[PDB]
Specification:
Chain A: Belongs to the nucleotide-sugar transporter family. SLC35B subfamily. The complex is a heterodimer of chains A (about 290) and B (about 240). Chain A is mainly alpha-helical. Chain A has one domain. Chain A has helices at about 1-25, 35-55, 65-90, 90-100, 105-115, 120-135, 145-170, 175-195, 195-205, 210-235, 240-260, 265-285. Chain B is mainly β. Chain B contains no helices and 24 strands. The radius of gyration of chain B is 18 Å and the shape is globular. Classes of the chains: A mainly alpha (about 290), B mainly beta (about 240). The structure holds adenosine-5'-diphosphate.
Chain lengths: ~290, ~240
């Protein structure tokens, strides 16, 4: 299962990033409607999850409490908005490397709240993976790093909530995805309506209807990814999903750099060898 | 469906001894590292009492004497300082799959021998075979539109429990797939009742029917039970007997 999930998430999110860059950097005026883009993505993902439930998991009955889904959705939205605000306040690469350090906060929050215990081998493997990924990514005053720290904390809280949900309610992947996406859609729609970006985005889309096409395609990609991601969240737990995401980002960066043939600095060599060492140790004892 | 087997049919123990009751499932009952097991205690002529959920968590208010252990397809319930109070039948239930099942039951015996939810069940005491039947469970002290599953269960002669069906406060209902074609569960919030209807009851349906309230946490737990109503299906009228 793990290789299949890795391959699917990697390719789907690579195409997702390509489409997101194409839409954002089109310069048709400038696209300053990120919030409505996330809202559309959430709506499409919710519709896809409903279709999957109706076609595959009709027999199952959801047992999770609604407030748990609401809490998970608000935590995820808070993480997203904090990361975007930090990116606005801080240079792009630093935000990327900060978001790459998800497993550490996820594990720490899990241990502190759910009282989970992990073997020190897992601790060392996760620390080594995170350090290697950070080192491989370019490595060179506050009030901008605090936002990244808050985003990491909110991501850890989301992981804790998902772990508790799956442990004590056996939540299905499709149900979890659908409910989280519905709550996120509600909150984002309320925020968009209040801020008024809905009308500006609608006028922008009417001026350039072609965007719609890409948007739809873009949204579809996200759906697929979320599915796999949520599967990885349920079958293996949030920590494994975080590690998978970080490793996927590292592999994408490594593939792009080697394709561009950018001189690989020795520090990047140490980073990649460390990432491989940690991944192998985790797999041998995973 | 999963079949639960309890190795000791009946255990003879002395006061103060440690007793271990074993239960085994036909299939793994672990869902993402948590064992979906429950243990109930039923005294004679009384509804089963909820004791343990998750195979390791003692229900609040239960004495610390009881404990649960095991994993995979083997579980055990331990009572080290057994007293006269904990003399009853013990049932192990699995919530891993929709047709929740109970073990054959283990009997324990001694040598030398407005502030809560109230449920009341009503229904005919004697019914001829092939006649549609309808039992009504009325709830007082609580509203069936709040967050709680309301289940209909039955116990055959021999103390072999069998979960018939349930309805959630949202109206979502689940049935035992074996009986999904024969029974139907409905509710009436105006009177705060819920009804179970059986079509063409046969002689095999003789049993004691309980209506219980359960909350889902690490599996479905029937914390609160009704007093049970008997139902006898016979081809003759019971008179002067
Ligand atoms: N533990 C998780 N729970 C829910 N969703 C997750 C989890 N991990 C990743 N995801 C999803 O996968 C996507 C990964 O995005 P990511 O690559 O982290 O964006 P960025 O590169 O801007 O940090 C997110 O949009 C998120 O919805």
């Amino acid at each position: 299962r793990l290789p299949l999930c890795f391959l699917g998430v990697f390719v789907c999110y690579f195409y997702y990033g390509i489409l997101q860059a194409k839409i954002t950097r089109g310069k048709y005026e400038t696209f300053t409607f990120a919030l409505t883009l996330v809202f559309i993505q959430c709506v499409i993902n919710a519709v896809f999850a409903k279709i999957l439930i109706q076609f595959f998991d009709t027999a199952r009955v959801d047992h999770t409490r609604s407030w748990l889904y609401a809490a998970c959705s608000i935590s995820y939205l808070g993480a997203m908005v904090s990361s975007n605000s930090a990116l606005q306040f801080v240079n792009y690469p630093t935000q990327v490397l900060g978001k790459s350090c998800k497993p550490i906060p996820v594990m720490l929050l899990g241990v502190t709240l759910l009282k989970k215990k992990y073997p020190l081998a897992k601790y060392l493997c996760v620390l080594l993976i995170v350090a290697g990924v950070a080192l491989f990514m370019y490595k060179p005053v506050g009030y901008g790093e605090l936002l990244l720290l808050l985003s990491l904390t909110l991501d850890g809280l989301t992981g804790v909530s998902q772990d508790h949900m799956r442990a004590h309610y056996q939540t299905g992947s499709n149900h979890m995805m659908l409910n989280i996406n519905l709550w996120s859609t509600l909150l984002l729609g309320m925020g968009i309506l209040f801020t008024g970006e809905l009308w500006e985005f609608l006028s922008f889309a009417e001026r350039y209807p072609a965007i719609i096409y890409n948007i739809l395609l873009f949204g579809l990609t996200s759906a697929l990814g979320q599915s796999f991601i949520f599967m990885t969240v349920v079958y293996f737990g949030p920590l494994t999903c975080s590690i998978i995401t970080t490793t996927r980002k590292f592999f994408t960066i490594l593939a792009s750099v080697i394709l561009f043939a950018n001189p690989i600095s020795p520090m990047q060599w140490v980073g990649t060898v460390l990432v491989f060492l940690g991944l192998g140790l985790d797999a041998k004892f995973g | 469906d999963i079949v639960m087997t309890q190795s000791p049919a009946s255990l003879t123990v002395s006061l103060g001894q440690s007793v271990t009751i074993s239960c085994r499932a036909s299939e793994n009952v672990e869902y993402y590292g948590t064992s979906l097991m429950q243990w109930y205690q039923q005294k004679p002529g009384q509804p089963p009492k909820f004791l343990i959920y998750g195979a390791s968590n003692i229900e609040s208010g239960v004495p610390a004497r009881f404990s649960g252990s095991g994993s995979g397809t083997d579980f055990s319930l331990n009572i080290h300082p057994v007293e006269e109070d904990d003399i009853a039948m013990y049932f192990c239930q699995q919530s891993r799959k929709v047709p929740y099942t109970f073990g054959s039951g283990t009997k324990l015996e001694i040598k030398g021998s407005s502030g809560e939810v109230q449920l009341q069940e009503s229904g005919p005491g004697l019914v001829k075979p092939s006649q549609s039947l309808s039992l009504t469970c009325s709830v007082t002290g609580y509203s069936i539109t709040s967050d709680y599953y309301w289940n209909w269960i039955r116990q055959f002669p021999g103390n072999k429990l069998e979960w018939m069906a349930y309805i959630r406060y949202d109206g979502t209902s689940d049935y035992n797939p074996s009986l999904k074609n024969r029974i139907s569960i409905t509710r009436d919030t105006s009177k705060n009742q819920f009804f179970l209807k059986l079509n063409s009851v046969a002689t095999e349906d003789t049993a004691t029917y309980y209506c219980a309230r359960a909350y889902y946490y690490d599996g479905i737990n029937f914390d609160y039970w009704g007093q049970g109503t008997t139902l006898t299906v016979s081809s003759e009228n019971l008179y002067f007997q």
